[PDB]
Amino acid sequence: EPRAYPFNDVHGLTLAGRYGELQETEPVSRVRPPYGEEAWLVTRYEDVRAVLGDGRFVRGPSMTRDEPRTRPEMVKGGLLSMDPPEHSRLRRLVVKAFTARRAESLRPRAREIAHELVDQMAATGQPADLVAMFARQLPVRVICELLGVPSADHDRFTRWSGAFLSTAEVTAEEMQEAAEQAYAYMGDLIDRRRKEPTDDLVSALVQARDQQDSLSEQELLDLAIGLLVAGYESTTTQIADFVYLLMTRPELRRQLLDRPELIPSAVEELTRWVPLGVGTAFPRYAVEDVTLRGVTIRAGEPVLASTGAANRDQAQFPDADRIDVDRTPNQHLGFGHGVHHCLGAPLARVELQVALEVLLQRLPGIRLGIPETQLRWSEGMLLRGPLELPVVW
Numbered sequence: 001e002p003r004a005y006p007f008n009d010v011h012g013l014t015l016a017g018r019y020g021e022l023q024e025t026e027p028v029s030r031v032r033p034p035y036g037e038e039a040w041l042v043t044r045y046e047d048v049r050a051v052l053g054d055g056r057f058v059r060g061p062s063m064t065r066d067e068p069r070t071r072p073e074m075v076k077g078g079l080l081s082m083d084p085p086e087h088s089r090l091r092r093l094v095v096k097a098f099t100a101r102r103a104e105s106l107r108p109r110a111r112e113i114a115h116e117l118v119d120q121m122a123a124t125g126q127p128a129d130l131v132a133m134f135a136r137q138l139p140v141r142v143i144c145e146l147l148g149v150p151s152a153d154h155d156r157f158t159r160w161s162g163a164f165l166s167t168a169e170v171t172a173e174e175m176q177e178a179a180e181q182a183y184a185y186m187g188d189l190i191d192r193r194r195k196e197p198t199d200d201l202v203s204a205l206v207q208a209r210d211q212q213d214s215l216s217e218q219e220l221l222d223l224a225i226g227l228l229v230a231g232y233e234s235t236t237t238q239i240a241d242f243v244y245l246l247m248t249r250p251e252l253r254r255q256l257l258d259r260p261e262l263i264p265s266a267v268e269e270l271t272r273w274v275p276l277g278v279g280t281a282f283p284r285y286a287v288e289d290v291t292l293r294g295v296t297i298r299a300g301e302p303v304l305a306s307t308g309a310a311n312r313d314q315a316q317f318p319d320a321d322r323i324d325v326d327r328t329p330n331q332h333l334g335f336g337h338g339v340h341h342c343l344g345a346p347l348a349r350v351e352l353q354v355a356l357e358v359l360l361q362r363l364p365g366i367r368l369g370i371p372e373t374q375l376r377w378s379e380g381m382l383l384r385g386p387l388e389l390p391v392v393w
C-alpha cells in the first residue's frame with residue numbers, strides 16, 4: 001500500500017507522471033524505497049516548502065536512523081545532518097566567509113577556466129565528450145579557486161576529487177586513498193593559511209569570528225571537504241543536463257544565442273524544471289505529530305519533501321511543464337528552502353551561467369554527435385544525468 005519508490009526513470013530527465021497524480025489525489029503518501037525505512041512522500045509545492053521551513057521537521061535523527069534511499073551505503077554527517085543550534089553556529093561562521101560577493105568575484109576566473117576547457121575540447125576534435133572534458137572539470141576547479149588551492153595543484157586535487165563522484169568506477173580502497181590525500185592536503189593548506197592568510201575562502205574561514213566563537217581545526221577541515229563534495233557532482237550533473245536540454249531543444253538554444261542576457265533567468269528556469277534527483281534525499285523527521293492535508297505524521301516518522309515535484313506543481317507554476325526562460329515569478333525550490341537552503345547557490349548560479357555563456361559563445365552550434373536515443377545515462381542512483389555527451393559543433 002506504499003508505492004515502490006523512486007518513481008523517476010534514471011534514463012532521462014522526465015518527471016514521473018506519478019508525482020502529478022499524487023499532487024492531485026494523495027499529496028501526502030507512503031513510499032517504500034530500495035533501502036531504508038518506508039516514509040511519507042510530500043509533493044505539492046506548498047507542503048514541500050512548508051516542511052522544509054518548519055521547526056518540527058529535523059535532520060539530526062539522520063545520524064541514528066535507516067534513511068529511505070536508493071543505495072546501500074549511507075553518506076552521513078555535514079551541515080545537512082545537523083539541527084539548530086549546532087547547525088546555526090556552523091552555518092553562521094561559514095556564510096560570514098562564503099559570501100555572495102565572494103561567489104560573484106569568481107565569475108572572471110570561472111569564465112577563464114571554462115574557455116581553457118573548451119580549448120582542450122577543440123584540440124582533440126569532434127566529437128568531444130562534454131561530460132568528461134567540461135562538466136566534470138569546471139565545478140571542481142572553481143572550488144579549487146574558491147578555497148585557495150594553488151594553480152599547480154588543481155590537476156591532482158581534481159584527480160582525487162573524481163573518486164568521490166557517485167559515477168566513479170573505483171574500488172572502495174581507491175576512493176579511500178583519494179579521500180585521505182584530499183584530507184591531508186586540505187589540512188596542510190588550512191595550516192598555511194592560518195599562519196599566512198590570503199584572500200581565499202580557507203583564509204576567511206580560518207579568521208571567521210562570531211561573538212568570540214571560531215571554527216575548530218576539525219570543523220575547518222570537515223567544512224572545506226564538505227563544500228567540495230556538496231559543490232562538485234551536483235553542479236557537474238546540472239551543467240550536463242542544461243547543455244543536453246540546450247542541444248536537444250533548438251528553441252531554447254536560439255533564445256539564448258539571440259538574447260544572452262536571458263542566461264541568468266534561464267538558469268533559474270532550468271533549475272526549476274529539471275527534476276535532478278532520482279528520488280528526494282535527506283528525509284526530515286517529525287519531532288512531534290503534525291497533521292498535513294488531513295494525514296497525521298507521527299513523531300519520529302521520515303518525510304521526503306520532493307523539490308523535483310514541487311517545482312513542477314501546476315498550482316504554483318502556470319504551465320509547469322513548459323520551459324519558459326523568462327518565467328517570472330520563479331520561486332523554485334531547486335536550491336532547497338529553510339535553514340538548509342543550498343549555501344553554495346550563489347556560486348552554483350555563477351557556474352551555471354558561465355558554462356552556458358562560454359559554451360554558447362565558443363560553440364554556438366554545439367549538438368549531439370550521436371542520436372538522442374543512444375545516450376548512456378548515469379545509474380549512480382543519486383542524480384540523473386548522461387554518463388557521456390559526445391558533442392559536435
Ligand code: HEM
Nearest residue numbers: 079080230231234235238282334335336340342343344348
Ligand atoms: C546546481 C548545483 C547545486 C544544486 C542543484 C544544489 C542543491 C542543493 C539543495 C537542494 C540543498 C538543500 C538540501 C536539503 O535541504 O535537503 C543544498 C544544500 C547545500 N549545498 Fe548545494 N546545490 C548545488 C551546488 C552547491 C555548491 C556549488 C556548493 C558549495 C560550494 C553547495 C554546498 C551546499 C551545502 C554545504 C549544503 C548544505 C546546507 C545546510 O545544511 O546548511 N551546493 N544544495
